[PDB]
Amino acid sequence: MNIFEMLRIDEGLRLKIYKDTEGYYTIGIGHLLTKSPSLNAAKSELDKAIGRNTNGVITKDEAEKLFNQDVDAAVRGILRNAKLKPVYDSLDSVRRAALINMVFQMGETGVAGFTNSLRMLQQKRWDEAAVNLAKSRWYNQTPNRAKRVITTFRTGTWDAYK
């Protein structure tokens, strides 16, 4: 198991514009396109992201290219963030994957906001961090995915994904 396979399980793959869990226009492997209600606005971002007229449909390779960019950007946003960088550096490889997954789903700012949980992770207080991460809109809106991420921080293994 690695970050790519982990997110591929959590996001799925869809080759046609669809609406995510919050109602936003998405495509490929969890690639948010626009928060706007406009499908046309979504088609527009999509063609710009791909470099061709897609008419809302992309191929497998294109989906995979967007995904690789987004994982790269997630890692780099973590490394550039004053709040996230220290947490990441302190973690083992499995747990680092779990922080990357949260960043990919909720963005850097969002994650930076879990102040208390972050401090707890840093301190390696596993059970405590798992209890605090659960008290969030995040866990309430996407509980199965949240539980998976949470198990990963609690245990340090890929168990929840196997």
* Cβ distance to Cl ion smaller for residue 49 or 91: 49
**Residue 47 vs 125, nearer CB to Cl ion:** 47
Instruction: Please give the torsion angle defined by the CA atoms of residues 45, 28, 65 and 161, in that order, rounded to the nearest 10 degrees.
Output: 140
**Would residue 108 show up in a list of annotated catalytic residues for this protein?**
no
User: Is 117 flagged in the annotation as binding?
Assistant: yes
Residue 77 beta carbon to Cl ion: minimum distance, rounded to whole angstroms: 14
Query: What's the token pair of residue 123?
Result: 């301190």
Whole-number minimum distance, CB 17 to Cl ion, in Å? Answer: 14
φ/ψ (deg, to 5) at 92: -75, 175
CB of 81 or CB of 142, closer to Cl ion? 142
- Residues of this chain that bind Cl ion (CB under 5 A): 49, 142, 144-145
φ, ψ for residue 19 (rounded to 5)? -110, 130
CA angle 83, 89, 94 (to 5 degrees): 115
Task: Work out how close the CB of 69 gets to Cl ion at its nearest, in angstroms, rounded to a whole number.
Answer: 6
61 included as an active-site residue: no
How near is the Cβ of 90 to Cl ion at its closest, in Å?
27
53 is in an annotated binding site: no
Q: Is 90 annotated as a binding residue?
A: no
Query: Which own/partner contact pairs does 77-81 have at CB distance under 8 Å and 24+ positions apart?
Result: 77/103, 77/108, 78/103, 78/108, 81/108, 81/112
13 assigned ligand-binding residue: no
- Closest to 143 measured CA to CA, from 154, 133, 153, 128: 133
DSSP H or E run through 17: strand 14-19
Measured from the CB atom, the residue of 65 and 125 that comes closer to Cl ion is 65
Choose the catalytic residue: 10, 11, 45, 70.
11
Q: Which residues are known binding-site members for substrate?
A: 32, 104, 117, 132
Q: Which residues are catalytic?
A: 11, 20
